[PDB]
Design a binder for this molecule. Structure first.
Ligand SMILES: O=c1ccn([C@H]2C[C@H](O)[C@@H](COP(=O)(O)O)O2)c(=O)[nH]1
Ligand SMILES: O=c1ccn([C@H]2C[C@H](O)[C@@H](COP(=O)(O)O)O2)c(=O)[nH]1
Ligand SMILES: Cc1cc(NS(=O)(=O)c2ccc(N)cc2)no1
Ligand SMILES: Cc1cc(NS(=O)(=O)c2ccc(N)cc2)no1
Lengths: 278, 279
């Protein structure tokens, strides 16, 4: 399973093109890649380098409750978003009137309130917009054959208000033989840092919705747009390709949860996770 | 040959797909998640193991580009693909009895050109309303080709109930390197035996058109599928089609220097050397 992520890193090193980027540092880049990670009795937390699993779980819980407030997640000891909610960064984009921590209408707003008129991170959006997360869950229960089970965070109208455009433009869910699968469209992926994390996020989400829907986790299909490696991270990765992968951990949910909103941190345990050091 | 990828995908579905049902109850063999890369360098991926309705491809795309959501405006060009979904009965079944025949709702033409504006009807004037995604994409390719956010999104959860059909082509993304423009389509649902060859041609063409406008060379079309399926009653014709050897892809020529995307006309295009197997 992890071989696919390794083979993808190798491919970019062996066939990617040099491509400048917004940061001016430069990458090796391939456009268009796809990998399928089984979720059947294992969880694809990568072993050839440690993934910040606390961040994955708490960020997803943050997403689910609809929050666009970087402080709400920082208080969990996960600071991924803090720099994009900083005062100077928000002023850098003309959001002087904004409060620090207000990320705009990012994933939380889009997943729970798509199409609603955003104001600030403290506003009350109850009943406003499309609750895509719950629509997906209802459709899985009532019509698992549906080929439109999509959750879309890419919102062209809200893009100017987001602190940064979402990398995870949309995901699609699928059911056959009582198995729940998920395909992520990730428009831009840093193989050295973001991507192993993002694989965890959406595999976790698939586990959660399969639990709520009475289904088994199936496959997680990861589809990349610009899949890249920053030039200054080539040497760490070449070392990492050398390290042989140890079997994927497993994920256990310690109690029968009924709604996606009822999940909490202590309902999840990663057992068997032996990553290589870095 | 790039058509071999399509053929291997068809074969993979017949050998490993799962017999899953669908909304029409007809029954399919289905695989969730596939990807193919069709080179666009000095050839056009118009499939040869079965003829593709190229006229339909060109006219539909031109219809999409000028923002239309009236099925009759495409029908009047000889392309009847959308007519059934704008019929009187079909519109009345969805709850659109106050809509004129042919009013498909905020489908692709509206989303590409006016994303976020309030849909009234097909004859409304939407000038300046919503996000012009198609032109934003063209602009970004020119001013900042390294950008990793060049996306055109037709999936609009707010507008979905207003549409005659939910779009199969949720979004596409463009990419520039080495003076070459590539395109990835996320297609949520794909009939391998009818729509898919057509869909591959649609977005390859769109890539040719936007490359022309931005002074770039077509690179790759990357085709990504969610539910890739074959209908049970089409298994036998496809398995005969799989033993046919593909002929070289035709070439597409653009017969004139065009400045803006709105300025393309049907006569600007010529498919040369298209020799598909008969049926
Ligand atoms: O969940 C995420 C978020 C960001 N990135 C990486 C990819 C890019 O290197 C950078 C985002 O920059 P842009 O694609 O917007 O230019 O961060 C990820 O890999 N995963
Ligand atoms: O451009 C298109 C439009 C439709 N279809 C096929 C896919 C499905 O077989 C059917 C659409 O029905 P749903 O995916 O919404 O269920 O038509 C395509 O392949 N390409
Ligand atoms: C915003 C924003 C940045 C971001 N980065 S990321 O690439 O997801 C990431 C993941 C883990 C760690 N430790 C750092 C960064 N995700 O959202
Ligand atoms: C409506 C509607 C159907 C549809 N399917 S399709 O795949 O575009 C298609 C292409 C050619 C033919 N002959 C029939 C259908 N796209 O929009």
């Amino acid at each position: 399973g992890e071989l696919q992520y390794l083979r993808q890193v190798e491919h970019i090193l062996r066939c990617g093109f040099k491509k400048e980027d917004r940061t001016g540092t430069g990458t090796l880049s391939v456009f268009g890649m796809q990998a399928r990670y089984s979720l059947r009795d294992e969880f694809p937390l990568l072993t050839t380098k440690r993934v910040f699993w606390k961040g994955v779980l708490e960020e997803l819980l943050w997403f689910i409750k609809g929050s666009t407030n970087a402080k709400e997640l920082s208080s969990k000891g996960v600071r991924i978003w803090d720099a994009n909610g900083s005062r100077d960064f928000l002023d850098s984009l003309g959001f002087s009137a904004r409060q620090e921590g207000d990320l705009g209408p990012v994933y939380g707003f889009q997943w729970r309130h798509f199409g609603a008129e955003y104001k600030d991170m403290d506003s009350d959006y109850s009943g406003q917009g499309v609750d895509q997360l719950q629509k997906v869950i209802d459709t899985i229960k009532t019509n698992p054959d549906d080929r439109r089970i999509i959750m879309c965070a890419w919102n062209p109208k809200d893009l100017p208000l987001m602190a940064l455009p979402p990398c995870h433009a949309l995901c699609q869910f699928y059911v056959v033989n009582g198995e729940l699968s998920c395909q992520l469209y990730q428009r831009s992926g840093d193989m050295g840092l973001g991507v192993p994390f993002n694989i965890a996020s959406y595999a976790l989400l698939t586990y959660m919705i399969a639990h709520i829907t009475g289904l088994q986790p199936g496959d997680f299909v990861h589809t990349l747009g610009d899949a890249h490696i920053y030039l200054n991270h080539i040497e760490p990765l070449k070392i990492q390709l050398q390290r042989e992968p140890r079997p994927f951990p497993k994920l256990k949910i310690l109690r029968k949860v009924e709604t996606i909103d009822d999940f909490k941190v202590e309902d999840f345990q990663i057992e068997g996770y032996n990553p290589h050091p870095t």
